[PDB]
Amino acid sequence: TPKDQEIKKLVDQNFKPLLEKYDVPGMAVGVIQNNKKYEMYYGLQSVQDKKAVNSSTIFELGSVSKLFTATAGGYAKNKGKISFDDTPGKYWKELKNTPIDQVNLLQLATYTSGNLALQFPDEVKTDQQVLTFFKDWKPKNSIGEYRQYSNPSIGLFGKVVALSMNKPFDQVLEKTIFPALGLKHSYVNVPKTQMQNYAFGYNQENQPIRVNPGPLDAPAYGVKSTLPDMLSFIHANLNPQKYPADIQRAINETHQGRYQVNTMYQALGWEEFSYPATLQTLLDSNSEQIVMKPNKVTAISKEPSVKMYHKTGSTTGFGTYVVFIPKENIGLVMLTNKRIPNEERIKAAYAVLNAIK
Ligand SMILES: *[B]([O])([O])[C]([C]N1[C]=C(C([O])=O)N=N1)[N]C(=O)[C]SC1=NN=C([N])S1
Numbered sequence: 001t002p003k004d005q006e007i008k009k010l011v012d013q014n015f016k017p018l019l020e021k022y023d024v025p026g027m028a029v030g031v032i033q034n035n036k037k038y039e040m041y042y043g044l045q046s047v048q049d050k051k052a053v054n055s056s057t058i059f060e061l062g063s064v065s066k067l068f069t070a071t072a073g074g075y076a077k078n079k080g081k082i083s084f085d086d087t088p089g090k091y092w093k094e095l096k097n098t099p100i101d102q103v104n105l106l107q108l109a110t111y112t113s114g115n116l117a118l119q120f121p122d123e124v125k126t127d128q129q130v131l132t133f134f135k136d137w138k139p140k141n142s143i144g145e146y147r148q149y150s151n152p153s154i155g156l157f158g159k160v161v162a163l164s165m166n167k168p169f170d171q172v173l174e175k176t177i178f179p180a181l182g183l184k185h186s187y188v189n190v191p192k193t194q195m196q197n198y199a200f201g202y203n204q205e206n207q208p209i210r211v212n213p214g215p216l217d218a219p220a221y222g223v224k225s226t227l228p229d230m231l232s233f234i235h236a237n238l239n240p241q242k243y244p245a246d247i248q249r250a251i252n253e254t255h256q257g258r259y260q261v262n263t264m265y266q267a268l269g270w271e272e273f274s275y276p277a278t279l280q281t282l283l284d285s286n287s288e289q290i291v292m293k294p295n296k297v298t299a300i301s302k303e304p305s306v307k308m309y310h311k312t313g314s315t316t317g318f319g320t321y322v323v324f325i326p327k328e329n330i331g332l333v334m335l336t337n338k339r340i341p342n343e344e345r346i347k348a349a350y351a352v353l354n355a356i357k
Contacts (some may be wrong), residue, residue: 003357007031007038010355014348015334019043022340025202026053028227030333032238033356037231045199045337048208058190058198058224059335060211062313064320065223067233067254068186069158070269072172072219073109074253075180078246081164084109088134088156091163100137100156107144108157110258110266112297115140116150120216127215130159146294147261151220154269158219169218180247181236186225188218198224199337201317206338209317221315227335234324234331237270237309255309259297261290265304266297271311274304275325279350282323286312286342310349312342321345323353330356 001009011029019027019042026043044050045057076082082091084106089096103113115138124133134156162169165176170188178186190198200208213222225233236243240251257265257272264285265272271285284290310323319339323346324331332349 003033003036004038007033007352007356008040010352011040014351016042018336018340018344018348022338022344023206024336024338024340025206026057026199026337028053028057028059028333028335030227030231031330031352031356032231032234032332033330035235035329037228037235039227039231041227045197046208047200047202047206053199053337055228056185056197056226058185058187058194058226059320059337060199060201060221060315060318061223061225061230061320061335062221062315062318064311064313064322065219065221066154066313067269067311067322068173068177068223069154069161069219070109070254070267071250072169072177073105073157073161074250074268075177075246076161076164077253078249082161086160088160091160092131092134094131095134098135098137099139100134102139103143105157105160106258108153108160109268111147111150111153112144113139113150113153114143114146114148116148116153118149118151118292120152120155120214120220122214124214124216130215141294145296147259147266147297148294149291152216155216155218155220159216173223180243181233183225183229183232186223186229188222188224190224197226199318201315202338203316204339211315211317221313227333230322230333230335231331234322234333237324238326238329238331255307257300257303260300261295261297264290265300267309269311270309272307272309274302275306275308275327277308279347282310282346282350283343285310286346310346312345314339314342319345321349323349325353328353
């Protein structure tokens, strides 16, 4: 049984049943092993257009967007445009001498401001409203001591990174970061020439929907990409040594764990784990306790040299999961145009990666 058919069988056994189980219109699953890429597509990118999912289909990445924000920040840091010790008022000068200016950029990137929730209010619709939000912001818990997974936290980080590069955030990714990685089908704003490839997302009633991020939400969940581009992104994370110094060091920054919460190490964007890791280890990182509630951070006790990394992402209409293991030179990408439980994504991926070869 050739490897391409072996991987297809495994994906059929573990991911394909999720389609019928959760009435998922379309799915893309990619495996990359030893620099060989395997692409498997299922169902429809648009139900009403009867357009099949293929290698050109653009999906909403949801929170996997934060991996690109982290990479952009690592890039800016290694170019000397920011220091992770800086505070936002250095770059968004209107925030100087406000309480949020006691939080440093690393703490924003890793969700430890001590008073930032998961979501940004939908009532904050303009960029001025965003600035006013952070001028009025007041602390709650000791800065840097509690992880509270937060869109506005990394959103502000993204805004600061862009300012340090004197470019809007969308241009940081589309003109600098995406080209640096050869990602030709990845977008913050999908151009008109690409909309024909942009999947409809489907909500829990299977009604079509696409994301409309707010003024602060692009760095938190505004990126769209295809399966080949995400496999290329995985490939870059598997072999950062290939790239010019600033991008190479940028990727390495996103791999450096900054603190631990139980078995999860919070890196920049990426969630990091000791490898081998149990299934429940990976599932715990997406538990209600870790995702929705504050958790005191602790110093990293076991600092693994053999690691794996992953990140789930969702929008109302899409689900994403990416995971890679450098020592095994393997990674996997799952994209769906319907949100399915994070646990099912992680379990199916775990089953495939541990049975490969
Ligand atoms: B991210 O994907 O983690 C982030 C938070 N999140 C997690 C989940 C889950 O566990 O299923 N859902 N959201 N993603 C977002 O905040 C994007 S959700 C939205 N889609 N469209 C909008 N206008 S907001």
